[PDB]
Amino acid sequence: AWQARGLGTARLQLVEFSAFVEPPDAVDSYQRHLFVHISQHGAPPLESVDVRQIYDKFPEKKGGLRELYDRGPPHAFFLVKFWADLNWSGGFYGVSSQYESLEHMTLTCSSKVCSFGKQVVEKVETERAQLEDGRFVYRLLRSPMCEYLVNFLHKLRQLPERYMMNSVLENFTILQVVTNRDTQELLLCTAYVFEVSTSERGAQHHIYRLVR
Secondary structure, three states, X not given: OOOOOOOEOOOOEEXXXXXXXXXXXXXXXXXXXXXXXXXXXOOOOOOEEEHHHHHHHOOOOOOOHHHHHHHOOHHHEEEEEEEEXXXXXXXXXXXXXXXXXXXXXXXXXXXXXXXOOXXXXXXEEEEEOEEOOOOEEEEEEEEEOOHHHHHHHHHHHXXXXXXXXXXXXXXXXXXXEEEEOOOOOEEEEEEEEEEEOOXXXXXXXXXXXXXX
């Protein structure tokens, strides 16, 4: 219909997102390990997942998934299931995001990190547009990972069975809200749930529309 084919609206599309580590000897010979990755640079509509099912995985009151979805707009809401690649200390742990739009705005991106459906850490970054080839571009490149996430990854990686990592990751989620800084209107809300991938398979994702 007017349904989504990937993670984005007509106002703000996600070009690429990744969380990575570069070992200290990437200086001598460069190498990057991706924990998670989405590259979106004539396709079927995305599958849908009912937003009520994951209410409890995210906080309530203000900034809660229920309230955000009640603000809308409904079509801006996505779920990303990650299978994270956790086989790869003291290198650079990074996160890179890039979005694209037709209109010039200033974005605020709030990444809320939740444990057992309860807000635990939050980052809030702002990014002005940059005009490139008609399209506007928002580049949050190589942002350093919060030391919470880096320690979590090290802790997580040493669990002796992967069903135990999946048990632990069951309760760990991330809510991402991108809003126009000026008009305060939500442009993009992405819910992330997490599994561990096996050793032989690298990172993966499935993107869903969140519906009601």
